[PDB]
Amino acid sequence: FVAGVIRRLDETVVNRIAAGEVIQRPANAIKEMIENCLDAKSTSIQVIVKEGGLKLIQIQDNGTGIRKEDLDIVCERFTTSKLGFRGEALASISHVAHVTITTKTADGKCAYRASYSDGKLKAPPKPCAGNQGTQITVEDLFYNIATRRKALKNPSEEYGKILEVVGRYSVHNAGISFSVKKQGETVADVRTLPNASTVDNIRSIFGNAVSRELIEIGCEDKTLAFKMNGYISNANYSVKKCIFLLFINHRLVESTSLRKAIETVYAAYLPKNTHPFLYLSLEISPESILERVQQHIESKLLG
Amino acid sequence: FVAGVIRRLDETVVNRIAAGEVIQRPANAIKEMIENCLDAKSTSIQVIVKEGGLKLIQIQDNGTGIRKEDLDIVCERFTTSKLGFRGEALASISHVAHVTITTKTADGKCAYRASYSDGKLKAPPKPCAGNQGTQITVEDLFYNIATRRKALKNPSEEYGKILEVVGRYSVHNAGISFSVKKQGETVADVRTLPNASTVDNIRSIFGNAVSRELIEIGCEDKTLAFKMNGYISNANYSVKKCIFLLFINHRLVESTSLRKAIETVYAAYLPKNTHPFLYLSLEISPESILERVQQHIESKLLG
Numbered sequence: 298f299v300a301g302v303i304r305r306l307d308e309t310v311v312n313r314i315a316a317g318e319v320i321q322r323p324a325n326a327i328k329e330m331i332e333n334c335l336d337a338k339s340t341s342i343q344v345i346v347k348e349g350g351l352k353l354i355q356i357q358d359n360g361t362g363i364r365k366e367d368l369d370i371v372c373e374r375f376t377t378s379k380l381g382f383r384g385e386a387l388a389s390i391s392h393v394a395h396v397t398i399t400t401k402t403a404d405g406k407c408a409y410r411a412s413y414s415d416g417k418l419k420a421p422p423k424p425c426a427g428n429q430g431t432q433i434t435v436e437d438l439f440y441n442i443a444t445r446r447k448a449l450k451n452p453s454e455e456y457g458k459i460l461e462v463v464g465r466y467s468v469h470n471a472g473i474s475f476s477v478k479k480q481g482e483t484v485a486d487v488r489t490l491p492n493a494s495t496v497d498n499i500r501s502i503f504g505n506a507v508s509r510e511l512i513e514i515g516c517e518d519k520t521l522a523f524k525m526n527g528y529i530s531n532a533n534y535s536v537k538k539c540i541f542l543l544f545i546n547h548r549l550v551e552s553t554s555l556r557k558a559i560e561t562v563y564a565a566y567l568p569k570n571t572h573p574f575l576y577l578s579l580e581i582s583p584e585s586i587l588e589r590v591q592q593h594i595e596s597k598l599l600g
Numbered sequence: 601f602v603a604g605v606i607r608r609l610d611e612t613v614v615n616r617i618a619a620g621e622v623i624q625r626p627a628n629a630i631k632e633m634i635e636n637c638l639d640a641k642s643t644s645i646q647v648i649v650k651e652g653g654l655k656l657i658q659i660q661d662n663g664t665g666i667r668k669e670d671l672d673i674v675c676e677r678f679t680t681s682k683l684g685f686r687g688e689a690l691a692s693i694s695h696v697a698h699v700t701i702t703t704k705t706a707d708g709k710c711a712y713r714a715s716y717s718d719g720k721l722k723a724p725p726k727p728c729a730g731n732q733g734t735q736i737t738v739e740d741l742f743y744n745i746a747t748r749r750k751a752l753k754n755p756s757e758e759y760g761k762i763l764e765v766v767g768r769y770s771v772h773n774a775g776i777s778f779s780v781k782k783q784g785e786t787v788a789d790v791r792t793l794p795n796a797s798t799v800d801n802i803r804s805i806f807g808n809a810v811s812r813e814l815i816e817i818g819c820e821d822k823t824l825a826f827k828m829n830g831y832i833s834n835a836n837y838s839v840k841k842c843i844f845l846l847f848i849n850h851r852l853v854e855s856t857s858l859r860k861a862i863e864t865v866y867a868a869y870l871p872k873n874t875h876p877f878l879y880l881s882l883e884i885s886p887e888s889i890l891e892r893v894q895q896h897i898e899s900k901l902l903g
């Protein structure tokens with residue numbers, strides 16, 4: 298038994314593998330990029346996809362853009378214009394894809410384009426055509442981690458997941474226009490419009506049969522420091538699988554705990570196989586609160 | 601609406617906060633350090649604690665030690681002598697505590713002592729007294745993150761958690777001697793001995809009433825690529841709360857899924873309130889396997 302010798306991991310490998318762990322699949326890259334479009338005050342967001350996002354993801358917005366002088370560092374880890382940690386999403390994407398950014402600010406004379414590998418600027422940004430806002434292009438996702446590339450689903454399931462994410466951000470963000478299409482196709486698979494209510498976007502993404510059966514919900518509680526709004530299906534609507542959109546502080550989230558609560562409430566009113574449609578937006582800042590929601594929904598179902 | 605300006609996070613803050621997130625509490629620092637003692641082929645491990653591990657944790661082993669020339673980088677991130685990622689545990693601890701290491705290799709002429717802040721060597725290592733192996737001393741845990749220091753439990757609950765961890769590693773590692781005491785006390789609260797069987801260490805840590813009621817278990821399956829051994833309580837033993845030790849590849853782990861399976865099996869044999877004692881060691885390399893364990897245990901309870 299002798300002592301080992303300590304070496305350093307190659308963190309070009311470490312950083313690639315961790316970035317794979319964060320991103321996971323094209324829908325998730327797209328989720329991060331959309332959130333950036335919304336943070337940059339965009340009112341029009343367009344998504345274009347080739348091969349389920351494995352070949353190309355392109356997202357164009359009309360938001361505030363990235364200043365020319367900041368393109369040097371925008372994809373580095375822990376660089377952010379905002380107050381896990383801020384500044385990891387584009388850095389991560391850039392470690393497992395070829396990223397190009399085309400962007401213009403109101404105060405810039407023209408748009409600039411820059412390309413990145415592993416978080417680093419490849420060359421000085423170059424002026425190009427383009428209007429107010431930002432187009433990010435993400436190519437060959439996981440070209441450098443074979444195991445995750447093969448561990449992804451077929452192109453049409455991955456496209457399916459992108460639709461789910463974008464359609465879901467579009468219900469939460471009524472008034473902002475969203476679209477998703479496959480590259481080289483002219484007709485969008487999802488398209489919402491700048492003057493749409495929350496209910497119109499539910500009708501558009503989820504169909505007239507759900508939109509006709511919605512109950513509006515809201516409750517605030519200053520003592521429990523939370524607010525909630527959204528829409529739920531009344532006791533007359535039933536499908537084979539529960540469609541549950543959940544947003545907590547404007548991020549889309551999954552929650553086995555709360556979907557359980559609400560299912561128990563609905564179990565008493567809906568048929569044996571069948572399930573509800575749920576859209577809830579919770580505003581919280583940093584337990585018994587999940588009683589008030591179960592209570593509030595049951596109250597609304599009884600009414 | 602104008603464009604932001606991108607700045608860099610201070611990663612002295614980032615690194616401190618993430619390290620808090622990993623470590624969480626003294627029992628967990630101790631878990632990481634013990635595992636290092638075992639990796640370094642230690643047969644005698646001594647733990648000493650002041651104030652539940654908030655003031656001092658000291659762990660002495662007789663393992664292979666750290667070479668003098670490697671003390672410079674041992675607490676840096678991603679430095680390891682081994683093949684999330686390797687090399688994060690001591691780096692993390694050193695970002696939220698004052699770490700001192702005293703260590704000797706068989707080939708070194710004497711032990712060397714070094715002190716670290718934020719992963720960096722404070723001064724050149726200095727020769728000192730000490731035998732084969734390594735003593736790590738971890739002081740003032742979370743002195744630099746007030747919110748986690750107050751979010752820790754009272755000193756005696758945290759000490760309680762250290763006992764749990766060490767007692768549990770000691771059942772898995774029969775033949776290796778472990779002890780834990782409070783600083784300045786002469787009698788250990790936990791002590792296992794170099795010639796002890798697994799059953800002796802269960803008797804010692806968990807008492808004669810459990811050790812008298814154990815069924816040995818083992819199953820291998822080449823097709824499902826797993827092995828399992830351990831000990832369980834037979835249908836005659838019952839306590840108010842389920843004591844379940846689980847090791848997968850020699851790390852202690854919690855598992856709501858498998859503890860559920862086994863509880864369902866035991867529910868049929870044990871009284872209404874009461875629960876079993878379980879020690880299982882699973883060897884796996886990188887679903888239907890949880891059926892074989894539920895099956896194998898029921899089989900052993902029926903027999």
Ligand SMILES: Nc1ncnc2c1ncn2[C@@H]1O[C@H](COP(=O)(O)OP(=O)(O)O)[C@@H](O)[C@H]1O
Binds near residue numbers: 330337382386604
């Ligand atoms: N669509 C966009 N429009 C304007 N700025 C963007 C856009 N996407 C990214 N950015 C800029 O790049 C930075 C890094 O983004 P990201 O890596 O997601 O970290 P974060 O959003 O936490 O700051 C943002 O703070 C922002 O300044």
Ligand SMILES: Nc1ncnc2c1ncn2[C@@H]1O[C@H](COP(=O)(O)OP(=O)(O)O)[C@@H](O)[C@H]1O
Binds near residue numbers: 663687690
């Ligand atoms: N008790 C110990 N005895 C010998 N070497 C140790 C001990 N603790 C830590 N080390 C050394 O420091 C390195 C860093 O430990 P750690 O930060 O836990 O990362 P890892 O265990 O993944 O290598 C180990 O690879 C090992 O060489």
Ligand SMILES: [Mg+2]
Binds near residue numbers: 329332333386
């Ligand atoms: Mg972002």
Ligand SMILES: [Mg+2]
Binds near residue numbers: 635689
């Ligand atoms: Mg370790």
